[model samples]
Target: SQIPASEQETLVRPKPLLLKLLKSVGAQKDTYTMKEVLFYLGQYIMTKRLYDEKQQHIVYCSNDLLGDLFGVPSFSVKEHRKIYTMIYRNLVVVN
Candidate 1:
C-alpha cells in the first residue's frame, strides 16, 4: 500500500486547451483537482438538459460545441470512464 505517487501529487493547472474548454462550460478558478473539474462539466450537462428521457445512462450530444467535444453522436454516463481519464491526463505538472 506504500506505492509512491510519482506520476501524481504535483500541483497542476489545466493546459490551454483544457482551460478554454472549462471556461466555456462556466468554470472559474486557479488550480484544480481532477475531481472538481468534472463537476463543472456535469453542471453543463444538467443545465443544458442533455440527458436522455428514458431510464438509462445516455447523454444527448447537441450540435456545435458540445457535439464536437464528444467526437461522437452519443455517450453513456456509466460506461465512459475513459473519457474522464482522458481529460485528467492532459494536465501539466507545475514547478
Candidate 2:
C-alpha cells in the first residue's frame, strides 16, 4: 500500500553521526538535530507523541543527558539554534 504526501512522508531523519549521538547518549524507548539533530529530535518528539495541535506541546523534557542538553526550563527560539550549532561543532572533533 502507498499513501500521498499529505501526511505520510513529512518528517525528519537522523544522519549517521546523529545516530551515534543517539546511541552514545542512550535513546529511551521514548525514541529520541541540525537537520540530523532536529531529525533525531523529531524522532524523540514523535516517539513521545508530544507535538500538540495547539502549537505548545504538553511536556518538555527530562533525562540525564537530555536534561543536561536542554539545561533547565524549556527551549525557546534561543537554545533551539544554539545547541544545534554547538553540539554539531563539538561532534566533529575527537574531543
Candidate 3:
C-alpha cells in the first residue's frame, strides 16, 4: 500500500517522535500486549506533531498504524481507549 502523504516524511528520515517510540518499545522486540502497544502509541501521538505541511493542519494516522502494527481488530476496548484518552487529554491541556 502507498504511504499516506502525511506519513511520507516519517517513512523517509523518520521524525524524532518516532525514534523516541522505538527506543521506548525496543525496535527488535517482536511481541507486545495490546495495552503495552497502546500505551506507547498514545504517548507518541500526544508528543508528536501529526500535521501535514501542505494541509497546514493535523492529520490522524495513529489508529491506522496501530492496527497495522499490532494486527488488532479494534482499539475501542475500555482500557485501551482510557489510556489513549488520558494521554491525549493531558497533552492537550499541557500544550
Candidate 4:
C-alpha cells in the first residue's frame, strides 16, 4: 500500500553530507562559493573511488550495529524504555 506524502514526513534518512560541508565552508559568509563546493563534493562523492569507498565503509558499520540491535524478532522501539530501566537497575546500583 502506498503511504500518503503527508504521513511520510517522519521517515528517517541518512543525514545530509552537503549540509555538513556547507557548515565547514561558512555558507553564511559566502553562499555562492559554498554552493560551488557543495556541487563539486556531491559529484566527486558520486564518481570518485576514494570518497565513495569512505562512505561505503561508514554505511557498513552503521548497518552492522542496526542489524544486531533491532533485527531480532522480539525487538521493538516502543519497549525501549522498559528494557533500559531494567538494565539500569541491574547494572548501575550504588557501589
Candidate 5:
C-alpha cells in the first residue's frame, strides 16, 4: 500500500518539541532511582550488563557476585510509595 507523498513528507519532518522533551528527561541523570533507570534503559549510559575485563575480574574474584552500582542510588519500598504520595500532595488541579 502506497501512502500519499504529502503524508510521507509530514512523517519525516523534524519533531523539535519531542526532541527537546527527550533531552530534558535525559538531563535528570543525578535524580534517577535504580528502578527508574532500569525501566528507562536507553536514556542514560546505564548498561544491562558489563563485559569489560576489570568488571569480569571483579565478579570472578568475588565468587561471581557483582558489587553495587557506583552512583545509581536505590529507592526503598517506602520511598517508592512516597513518590506517588508527594505527587498527589502537591498536585492542585485548577478548574
Candidate 6:
C-alpha cells in the first residue's frame, strides 16, 4: 500500500549503526570527533533511509547536526548539502 507523504513523516527510522557504535564505545571513553562522526552518520543514515524496506523512495541527509557541531544550530537546506558532501569526501577512498 502506498502511504501519503504527510503520514510518512511519522514513520520510525532505524539507527543500527548508531546503536552499534554506542555500545562499541560503551566500555571505553569517546573522542569528540568520534562522537560527531557517529552522530552525523546516524542522521545521514536515517535521512537517506539507507536501511528502509522500500528502496524506491529517495532522500538525503541534513546538516542540522553538522551545523550544531561547527556552526549555528539553525537549519538550512544548503547546509544539508554541504554536510553530506563532507561526509562522502571523508568516507569514499579512491584507488
Best by lDDT: 1
Question: How many residue pairs in model 6 have overlapping backbones?
Answer: 0
Error of 3 at 71 (Å): 13
Model 4 compared with the native: what TM-score? 0.21
- Per-residue lDDT of model 1, residues 1-95, tens digit only: 13134433445687666676678777877577555666666777777778766744777775744455556666777754555555556666564
lDDT of 5 by residue, 15-44 (tens): 233233224445343333323432332342
Give the higher-TM-score candidate: 1 or 6. 1
TM-score of every candidate: 0.61, 0.41, 0.29, 0.21, 0.19, 0.24
Candidate 3, 52-87: lDDT as tens digits: 556533434455543333344443333534434433
1-95: candidate 6 lDDT, tens digit per residue: 23233432322222334334334434233222332453545555465454435643323223533333334333333344454443333332221
TM-score computed on alpha carbons, candidate 1: 0.61
Write the candidate numbers in order of decreasing TM-score: 1, 2, 3, 6, 4, 5
Give the Å shift of residue 80 in candidate 1: 4.5
For residues 4-80, could you state the per-residue lDDT of candidate 2 as single tens digits? 33322323334354455466535532212133445555566556644355665443555534444545344443344
> Which 10-residue span in candidate 6 carries the lowest summed lDDT?
7-16
lDDT at 7, model 6:
31
The candidate with the higher TM-score, 2 or 4, is 2
The weakest ten consecutive residues by lDDT in model 2 span 28-37
Answer with 4 or 6, whichever has the higher TM-score: 6
Write down the RMSD of all candidates, one decimal each: 4.8, 9.8, 15.0, 15.0, 15.6, 14.0
Instruction: Give me candidate 2's TM-score against the actual structure.
Output: 0.41
Task: List where candidate 3 sits over 4 angstroms from the true fold.
Answer: 1-28, 51-59, 62-95
Report residue 85 deviation for candidate 3 (angstroms).
17
lDDT by candidate, in order shown: 0.62, 0.44, 0.40, 0.32, 0.29, 0.38
What does candidate 4's lDDT look like per residue over 61-88, in tens digits? 1233222322332232235343333223
